[PDB]
Design a protein around this nucleic acid. Structure first.
Ligand SMILES: [K+]
Ligand SMILES: [K+]
Ligand SMILES: [K+]
Ligand SMILES: [K+]
Ligand SMILES: [K+]
Ligand SMILES: [K+]
Ligand SMILES: [Mg+2]
Ligand SMILES: [Mg+2]
Ligand SMILES: [Mg+2]
Ligand SMILES: [Mg+2]
Ligand SMILES: [Mg+2]
Ligand SMILES: [Mg+2]
Ligand SMILES: [Mg+2]
Ligand SMILES: [Mg+2]
Ligand SMILES: [Mg+2]
Ligand SMILES: [Mg+2]
Ligand SMILES: [Mg+2]
Ligand SMILES: [Mg+2]
Ligand SMILES: [Mg+2]
Ligand SMILES: [Mg+2]
Ligand SMILES: [Mg+2]
Ligand SMILES: [Mg+2]
Ligand SMILES: [Mg+2]
Ligand SMILES: [Mg+2]
Ligand SMILES: [Mg+2]
Ligand SMILES: [Mg+2]
Ligand SMILES: [Mg+2]
Ligand SMILES: [Mg+2]
Ligand SMILES: [Mg+2]
Ligand SMILES: [Zn+2]
Lengths: 127, 60, 24, 98, 125, 80, 155
RNA sequence: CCGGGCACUCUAACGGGACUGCCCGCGAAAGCGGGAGGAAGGAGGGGACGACGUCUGGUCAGCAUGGCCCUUACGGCCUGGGCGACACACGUGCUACAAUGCCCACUACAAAGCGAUGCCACCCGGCAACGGGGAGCUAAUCGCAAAAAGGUGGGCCCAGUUCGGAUUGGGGUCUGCAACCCGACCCCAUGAAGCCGGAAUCGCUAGUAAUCGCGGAUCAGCCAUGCCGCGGUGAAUACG
């Protein structure tokens, strides 16, 4: 009937509901290539399917909010991977290697004082 | 904080403009936060003593 | 660029609005 | 249906004394909208450690205001009893409407 | 073709071209081609003798340009100086005239940098 | 590209003092400490000594000087 | 790297040729982190390698990278008296890093007015033995071998 | 959007979990290498935190304090000027020199913050700054608000230019008793140097550098391109 895995990346949350069908993916209404397109990246978000060999079997209603598109592109990579787990759990044994199930902890490092950008330190002369 | 200068307290400055803030605790003119009435130094000292309610050492 | 007072970026950077950067 | 809002600097002087104005309403009124969180209003103060120059030291200070809701559906005149004047928080402030 | 004063723009957008005119900026250009129904995008060399006229007609009479403007500007500055105005004295010895710091910078108004001898014994760093 | 708005300013110490010198003559010299006051018609002809932060400078006023502030004719800094 | 041996980074294979080497080149072409604009460029240029060649762009690309790889390069080393330019083998990894860095560099030295054209023509010219990059590769190789006299400073 | 419901996102509070426990190898042990499971390992990533001591280090102009000195003035009030001076020299930065670009239009994803004589929706006049009117907001319920880079379309066509916005002329808005000295801002005109920088020299090892914009503190206003923060996009390289 339905399947749903969350998925987050660099402060981006993606709701991914996979439902048997053609394979036409929606995102905040707009078509997949409507919320993206112009972003050579995007194509990768649907890599979870391609790996397990889905695509032609699932449709997908997706919600996306928080951060930036390339981030969203990655949160969605988890949704389509976590929801795809509820479907068949024997899939986890195929996404582990690919790592599509791993949440990407990499985030913006805090801006420290004395510095200009957390690490970028001001320059000096000494003469 | 020279004394003849802590005259600031003057609801009658003559012109709202000349009305500058000062440190409630030291008289310090510069770096006088508004939420406390204190200056940048006093604010740190007291916060350390715990006398500034809620005020805590922020880290993230 | 960001230095041109009479341009979009010019206004963004200078944080203002006007003929060259209308308040919508 | 009484809108309740609990603000404070302590996340226990509220979160806790926010169940007293819920339990003392579970058996005297409706079911209550339970205690509702609400984001915090963190005010930061960044100051220079030393009293003269050395402007690259700083040290940070925050004064975060926590918030709570509650909301008692059905203005139960029987709930107004347990409540009214029976609590223990000293560092709290209440704002409530109908 | 030749418009306002002895100047002649060429082989490139009329708006862009009109820019080579003295008192004509990029705004005055958009307006002239506007209040003269000429497509700004047309390459001057592809203008109608009729358009060139309607264009010349406007610009010529509607704004002060070329020699005319310079004579005015030159005239205003002269006045500032003649009346002992402070803003005038700045012009008197080419120094910033709009409340700008002169300890450093002010090179455009001062021109080439005329270095001299100085005290290097003290770290002027 | 100067400005002031819609209500030109002028200190009344002389605003009326000057006009009074017109009510019965013109007089000679004047001493002000308001280099911030705009110059208006009724001043032309007069001779006001503006303070340059140190002294009172004899500033003769002409028609082509209206609009300018008095300070603009009393230079504060002494250079080379 | 004083303590460790510094492991190498792994890059997500290409969203097209599904090749890592391509992404490497993409990143070298990148600038100010505009990876999108960067990716476009390689692709457009990647197309231009056709309708100019009946061959696949990837085969062209991968062989250009090859002719630009230096097999020897001269490195410094003070030996009491001055510095002796010592020739020596170039590691398999530096070869790649150098090759790609050089392509983007030569490419951007070309006169072609727009990016994709430049990468494209440099890719091509390189593939057949000519072009800025290959020149560099040969000046380097010529540097080494031109200092055979200091070969005994192995290291 | 309303009924509606708290599964999801989220908000904020408690708690779970990682310990070389778990498997092969080396080892006397500690621990090292590798894998499995797992969102995460081996200090997971970033902070707060910086010993005995050193430098007769910095500050008596934050405050405190011994001594010393002035007490119709080394105290005090005020108006004005000065701290904004300019032959020169250095530091830190900003914007650039452009086509991986600039412009115009249209269209899309953020986080953290601030808001009562305060943020100001929406409306009208103005090219605009802004002015008049005025809804909501004790602010996860309204406002600052647009995020920008990005995507789409069109333009420019290699030129000191549709690059770059210095300088100067004119007109005007606004805060404030008052913008000459000495404010920011809009609009017209002007349109400088600059074609990527000698010797020399600085930062950075990953979501970092680089790049993009956003908020705040102080504050009437502002000379912030500064400072303390936020998130978008997102590298190269490390033999040694
Ligand atoms: K430093
Ligand atoms: K730039
Ligand atoms: K110049
Ligand atoms: K940690
Ligand atoms: K000492
Ligand atoms: K350079
Ligand atoms: Mg950043
Ligand atoms: Mg004292
Ligand atoms: Mg003030
Ligand atoms: Mg103050
Ligand atoms: Mg420009
Ligand atoms: Mg612009
Ligand atoms: Mg012109
Ligand atoms: Mg000056
Ligand atoms: Mg062990
Ligand atoms: Mg053993
Ligand atoms: Mg410790
Ligand atoms: Mg000492
Ligand atoms: Mg000293
Ligand atoms: Mg100073
Ligand atoms: Mg510099
Ligand atoms: Mg209008
Ligand atoms: Mg275009
Ligand atoms: Mg130009
Ligand atoms: Mg050029
Ligand atoms: Mg540096
Ligand atoms: Mg401010
Ligand atoms: Mg200034
Ligand atoms: Mg700012
Ligand atoms: Zn104080």
């Amino acid at each position: 009937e339905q399947y749903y895995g969350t998925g987050r990346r660099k402060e981006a949350v993606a709701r991914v509901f996979l439902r048997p069908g053609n394979g036409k993916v929606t995102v905040n209404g707009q078509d997949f290539n409507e919320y993206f397109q112009g972003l050579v990246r995007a194509v990768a978000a649907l890599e979870p399917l391609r790996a397990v060999d889905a695509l032609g079997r699932f449709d997908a209603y997706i919600t996306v909010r928080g951060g930036g598109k390339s981030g969203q592109i990655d949160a969605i990579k988890l949704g389509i991977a976590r929801a795809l787990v509820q479907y068949n759990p024997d899939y986890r044994a195929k996404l582990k290697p690919l790592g599509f199930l791993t949440r990407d902890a990499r985030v913006v490092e805090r801006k420290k004082y004395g510095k200009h950008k957390a690490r970028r330190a001001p320059q000096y002369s000494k003469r | 904080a020279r004394k003849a200068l802590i005259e600031k307290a003057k609801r009658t400055p003559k012109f709202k403009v000349r009305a500058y803030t000062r440190c409630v605790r030291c008289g310090r003119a510069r770096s006088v936060y508004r939420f406390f009435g204190l200056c940048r130094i006093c604010l740190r000292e007291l916060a350390h003593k715990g006398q500034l309610p809620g005020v805590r050492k922020a880290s993230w | 660029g960001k230095g041109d007072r009479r341009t979009r970026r010019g206004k963004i950077w200078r944080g203002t609005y006007g003929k060259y950067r209308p308040r919508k | 249906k009484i809108r309740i809002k609990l603000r404070g600097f302590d996340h226990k002087t509220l979160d806790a004394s926010a169940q007293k104005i819920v339990e003392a309403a579970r058996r005297s009124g409706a079911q209550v909208s339970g205690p509702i969180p609400l984001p915090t209003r963190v005010r930061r103060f960044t100051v220079i450690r030393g009293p003269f120059k050395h402007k690259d030291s700083r040290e940070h200070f925050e004064l975060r205001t926590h918030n709570r809701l509650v909301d008692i559906i059905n203005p139960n005149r029987k709930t107004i009893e347990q409540l009214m004047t029976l609590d223990l928080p000293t560092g709290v402030e209440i704002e409530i409407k109908t | 073709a030749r418009i306002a004063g002895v100047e002649i723009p060429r082989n490139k957008r009329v708006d862009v071209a009109l820019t080579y005119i003295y008192g004509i900026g990029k705004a005055r250009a958009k307006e002239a081609l506007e209040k003269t129904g000429i497509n700004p995008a047309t390459r001057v060399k592809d203008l109608t003798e009729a358009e060139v006229v309607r264009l010349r007609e406007y610009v010529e009479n509607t704004w002060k340009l070329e020699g005319e403007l310079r004579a005015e500007v030159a005239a205003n500055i002269k006045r500032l100086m003649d009346i002992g105005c402070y803003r005038g004295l700045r012009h008197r010895r080419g120094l910033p005239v709009r409340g700008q710091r002169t300890r450093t910078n002010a090179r455009t108004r001062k021109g080439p940098r005329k270095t001299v001898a100085g005290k290097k014994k003290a770290p002027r760093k | 590209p100067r400005s002031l708005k819609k209500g030109v300013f002028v200190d009344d110490h002389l605003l009326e003092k000057v006009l009074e010198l017109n009510a019965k003559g013109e007089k000679r010299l004047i001493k002000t400490w308001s280099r911030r006051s705009t110059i208006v018609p009724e001043m032309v002809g007069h001779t006001i000594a503006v303070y340059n932060g140190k002294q009172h400078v004899p500033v003769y006023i002409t028609e082509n000087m209206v609009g300018h502030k008095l300070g603009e004719f009393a230079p504060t800094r002494t250079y080379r | 790297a004083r303590r460790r041996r510094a492991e190498v980074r792994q890059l997500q294979p290409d969203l097209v040729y599904g090749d890592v080497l391509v992404t490497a080149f993409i990143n070298k072409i990148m600038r100010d982190g505009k990876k999108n604009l960067a990716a476009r460029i390689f692709y457009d240029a990647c197309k231009i390698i056709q309708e100019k060649t009946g061959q696949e762009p990837l085969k062209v690309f991968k062989q250009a990278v090859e002719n630009v790889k230096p097999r020897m390069e001269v490195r410094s080393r003070r030996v009491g008296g001055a510095n002796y330019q010592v020739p020596m083998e170039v590691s398999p990894r530096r070869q790649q890093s150098l090759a790609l860095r050089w392509l983007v560099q030569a490419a951007n030295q070309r006169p072609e007015r727009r990016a994709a054209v430049r990468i494209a023509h440099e890719l091509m010219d390189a593939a057949e033995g000519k072009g800025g990059a290959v020149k560099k590769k040969e000046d380097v190789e010529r540097m080494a071998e031109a200092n055979r006299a200091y070969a005994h400073y192995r290291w």
